[PDB]
């Protein structure tokens, strides 16, 4: 599309701060790097196996009773340490996420939070047991460590209330809320979660829960987002899903993980955030470890087109996306986070797609903040400010720099 259409697309960096602790300063630096490279958003997983975000008030009402704030905080901390007791820290505070959002906003960077369920919720499962909610776990080939039992009302009522509170905090602070839903019970079904749901006639109950979280998002003025996995599994539609969800599409799946195609979901009216698995990097991952190692991720930022949805060949298949997301995962969270690796990956994606990414506007904001005299000198500042172009992409840094230089002189 046009110059305007390209720059209006979302350019997103995702950070798995669910499995692994990131300090507020580490995340601010990511925001900084995103702002310079011309991204529009930071996607931040806060619940993803671990749950590394606590609000000031964590009081929950569900199941006819209340769970007091201190007990919820204690339970969640215990759940999170039980998944991984990160030496670097456990959870971000309300004050810290509030500051990250404000800080990002000052650099025209949005934040997109993710709180995962009913899969990738190890911490919430143990937390619920510490609060007296027995057997919240899905149980298939074994008792799952990651996933909630969809028939357990007590657990479901609790989790929904908890996600409601988080959504309450983000309401009016962010546009988007990602409720996840990927890889249901992968640990207990050898990554055949959806097949197991259908087998047990529980997929309809998955949709009921997915639709609930979508509705919850919308009634709090948040645009819902979820991963594509659970939606219209195997291109079948006898179970219906909320059409308003923004789909974070990462893959059509693997042998016998028979996900809906992007073609099929588009046909149902869905819009996509292009979250191609091609751009995945797992901290510390090398060729010998499996998929999603650094060298290949870096290669793919050039090799896979910006608009190419996974399992499709662009432009032969050309489906509406709202933008694209590159993803940093923490599967082994004891692995050392090396900022420079993430920065190289981010830079490569921006460099290969200069039409989509903004120019770096940081020097401009620094020169503007220096403003507080004759009519001649004030006239000089008048025109130099008028000459500023806020619409420049990454191809036009030199051009922006000249405009800033002229402002400095004035
Ligand atoms: C939505 C998503 O990307 N989920 C997981 C994810 N899924 O990627 C897969 O390839 N998952 C998968 C593998 C085999 C069978 C089914 C799904 O990738 C990341 C890096 O490994 C994990 O951190 C994520 O939790
Ligand atoms: Br079913
Ligand atoms: Br590598
Ligand atoms: Br680990």
From Swiss-Prot:
This is Beta-N-acetylhexosaminidase. Residues 5-410 are annotated as: Catalytic domain 2. It is found in: Secreted, Cell wall. It comes from Streptococcus pneumoniae serotype 4 (strain ATCC BAA-334 / TIGR4). Belongs to the glycosyl hydrolase 20 family. The gene is strH. It comes from the Bacteria.
């Amino acid at each position: 599309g046009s110059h305007m259409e390209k720059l209006a697309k979302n350019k997103v960096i995702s950070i798995d701060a669910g499995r692994k602790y990131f300090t507020l300063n580490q995340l601010k630096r990511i925001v900084d790097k995103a702002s310079e490279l011309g991204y529009s958003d930071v996607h931040l997983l806060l619940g993803n196996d671990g749950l590394r975000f606590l609000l000031d008030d964590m009081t929950i009402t569900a199941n006819g009773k209340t769970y007091a704030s201190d007990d919820v905080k204690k339970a969640i901390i215990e759940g999170t340490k039980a998944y991984y007791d990160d030496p670097n820290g456990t959870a971000l505070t309300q004050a810290e996420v509030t500051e990250l959002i404000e800080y990002a906003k000052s650099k025209d960077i949005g934040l997109i939070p993710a709180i995962n369920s009913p899969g990738h919720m190890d911490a919430m499962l143990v937390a619920m047991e510490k609060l007296g909610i027995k057997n919240p776990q899905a149980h298939f080939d074994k008792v799952s460590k990651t996933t909630m039992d969809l028939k357990n009302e007590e657990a479901m009522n609790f989790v929904k209330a908890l996600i409601g509170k988080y959504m309450d905090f983000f309401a009016g602070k962010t546009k988007i809320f990602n409720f996840g839903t990927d890889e249901y019970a992968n640990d207990a079904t050898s990554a055949q979660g959806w097949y197991y749901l259908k087998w047990y006639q529980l997929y309809g109950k998955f949709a009921e829960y997915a639709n609930t979280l979508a509705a919850m998002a919308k009634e709090r003025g948040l645009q819902p987002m979820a991963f594509n996995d659970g939606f219209y599994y195997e291109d079948k539609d006898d179970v219906q899903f909320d059409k308003d969800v923004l789909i974070s599409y990462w893959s059509k799946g693997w042998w016998g993980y028979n996900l809906a195609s992007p073609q099929y979901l588009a046909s149902k009216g869905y819009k996509f955030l292009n979250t191609n698995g091609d751009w995945y990097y797992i901290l510390g991952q090398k060729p010998e470890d499996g998929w999603y190692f650094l060298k290949k991720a870096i290669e793919n930022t050039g090799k896979t087109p910006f608009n190419q949805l996974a399992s499709t060949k662009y432009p032969e298949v050309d489906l509406p996306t709202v933008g694209s997301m590159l993803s940093i995962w923490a599967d082994r969270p004891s692995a050392e986070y090396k900022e420079e690796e993430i920065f190289e990956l981010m830079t490569a994606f921006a460099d290969h797609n200069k039409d989509y990414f903004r120019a770096n506007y940081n020097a401009l904001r620094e020169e503007l903040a220096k403003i507080p005299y004759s009519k001649e000198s004030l006239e000089a500042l008048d025109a130099a400010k008028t000459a500023l172009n806020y619409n420049l992409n990454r191809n036009k840094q030199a051009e922006l720099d000249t405009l800033v230089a002229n402002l400095k002189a004035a």
